[PDB]
Antibody, heavy 240, light 217 residues
Framework: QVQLVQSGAEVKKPGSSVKVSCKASGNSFSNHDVHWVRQATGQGLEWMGW????????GLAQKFQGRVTITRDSGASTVYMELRGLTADDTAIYYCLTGSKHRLRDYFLYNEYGPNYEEWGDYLATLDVWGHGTAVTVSSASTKGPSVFPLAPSSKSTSGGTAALGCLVKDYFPEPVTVSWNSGALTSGVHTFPAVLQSSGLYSLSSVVTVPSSSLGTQTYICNVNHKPSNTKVDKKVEP | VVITQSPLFLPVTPGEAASLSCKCS???????????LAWYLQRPGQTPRLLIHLATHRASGVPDRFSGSGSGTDFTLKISRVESDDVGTYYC?????????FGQGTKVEIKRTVAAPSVFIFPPSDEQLKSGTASVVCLLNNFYPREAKVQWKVDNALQSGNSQESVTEQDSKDSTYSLSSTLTLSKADYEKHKVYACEVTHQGLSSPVTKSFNRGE
């Protein structure tokens, strides 16, 4: 159970470059191949490149040809992936990972009069340990804490003994934001929606919860909003 | 070298079997005999978990209801007795031809009976209005299947280009989805109109449902 540690989230302007780093417990990149995989929100896995733990082989996807450098320090203590010429299309979570290969002799021709003719190939057998990822956001936006507005429970959010209420978490950058209710004490019937990216380049999301209509007179509802990038911590009471 | 996964979207009745196809334009069999094809499950919020490697081998700790087969170009992942822990996206990955590549994925969800959304509407807060903007929020709660349509009306006029929506992941307990839509206007536009309405279409509704309020009361 090797653990991979990745560098922190970054925001980069279109046209610039990011260099992501990765370390493995026990210096495991010495003995296990490194892979890079990225994934944009709501989209598929995309293999980027790899380096053999032997340090004698590197490869990239066709799309990253001329865009990406994969390198490591001596003793393979840290591994790096540099992506240049960033666009909004490069906004994704970038994962570092270990994998296993089969290094096999593909070509062999017997030479009776000296060393043999050989060619060896690498074949990917497994992707093993995934890092937690590094979120890279490609945008010219400025860090901004959200405004938090109540979604008040009313007759227009109530029926059959149940009411809905929520918080609108408007205009923040970058991701991520976390939301809890009553300091984690309220979890049943909570829906916290994925953020949407607005035209302004800022994000918004809402969190809603359904509760018994009965309880509106007596139970307090507070949404707790945390936006670490801006050190913004908001507790908002939601009244009828 | 191309990979096609099929189907793109697969609803499965709990306890029923599932069958996923991964086909490649080129053989994935090395001359030594091994097929370099792997299957991965990615659940919402998680990194992918290896299920099957070298086409037919379960990975360590993978329950025996997952099984892989196939050789050459055509490969299958069977899941017997599907449950909510099996929900997510399944990717195959070919490891024979450099550069290595993932398939585009098959999305698997729990199939359940039809459920129309409960629809709730929220006017903008007095605090938000103070700042010169009005967001109206519509919530569609606990519906299935995932396909739903929200149309915002202002004094019955159809709106476009001023709203955004977001859908949750499938609830593991009741197998439903929830959706929120947010209409955004300036305070100025918002105060020129009276009726704000969220009109909703879904397989579970025999005709569209409108939730509305009048500005003020």
């Amino acid at each position: 159970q090797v653990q991979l540690v990745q560098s922190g989230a970054e925001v980069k302007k279109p046209g610039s470059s990011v260099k992501v780093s990765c370390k493995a417990s026990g210096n495991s990149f010495s003995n296990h191949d490194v892979h890079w995989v990225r994934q944009a929100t709501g989209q598929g896995l995309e293999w980027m490149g790899w380096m053999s733990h032997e340090g004698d082989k590197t490869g990239l996807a066709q799309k990253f040809q001329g865009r990406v450098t994969i390198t490591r320090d001596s003793g393979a203590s840290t591994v790096y992936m540099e992506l240049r010429g960033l666009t909004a299309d490069d906004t994704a979570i970038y994962y570092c990972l270990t994998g296993s290969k089969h290094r096999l002799r593909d070509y062999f021709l017997y030479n009776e009069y000296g060393p043999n003719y050989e060619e060896w190939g690498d074949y990917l057998a497994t992707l093993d340990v995934w890092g937690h990822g590094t979120a890279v956001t490609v945008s010219s936006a400025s860090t901004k804490g959200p405004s938090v507005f109540p979604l008040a429970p009313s007759s227009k959010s109530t029926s059959g003994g149940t009411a809905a209420l929520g918080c609108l978490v408007k205009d923040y950058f970058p991701e991520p934001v976390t939301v809890s209710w009553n300091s984690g004490a309220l979890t049943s019937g909570v829906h916290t929606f994925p953020a949407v990216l607005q035209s302004s380049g800022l994000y918004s999301l809402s969190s809603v919860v359904t509760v018994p209509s009965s309880s509106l007179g007596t139970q307090t509802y507070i949404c707790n909003v945390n936006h670490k990038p801006s050190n913004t911590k908001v507790d908002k009471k939601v009244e009828p | 070298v191309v990979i096609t996964q099929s189907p793109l979207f697969l609803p499965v009745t709990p306890g029923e079997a599932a069958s996923l196809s991964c086909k490649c334009s080129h053989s994935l069999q090395h001359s030594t005999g091994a097929n370099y094809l792997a299957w991965y499950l990615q659940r919402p919020g998680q990194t992918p978990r290896l299920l099957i490697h070298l086409a037919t081998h379960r990975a360590s700790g993978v329950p025996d209801r997952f099984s892989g087969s196939g050789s050459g170009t055509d490969f299958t992942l069977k899941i017997s007795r599907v449950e909510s822990d099996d929900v997510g996206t399944y990717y195959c990955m070919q490891g024979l031809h450099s550069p290595w590549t993932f398939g585009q994925g098959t999305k698997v969800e729990i199939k359940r009976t039809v459920a129309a959304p409960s629809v709730f509407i929220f006017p903008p807060s007095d605090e938000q209005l103070k700042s010169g903007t009005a967001s109206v929020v519509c919530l569609l709660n606990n519906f299935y299947p995932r396909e739903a349509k929200v149309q915002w009306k202002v004094d019955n006029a159809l709106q476009s280009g001023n709203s955004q929506e977001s859908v949750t992941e499938q609830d593991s307990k009741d197998s439903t989805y929830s959706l929120s839509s947010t209409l955004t206007l300036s305070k100025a536009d918002y105060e020129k109109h009276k009726v704000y309405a969220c009109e909703v279409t879904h397989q579970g509704l025999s005709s569209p449902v409108t939730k509305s309020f009048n500005r003020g009361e």
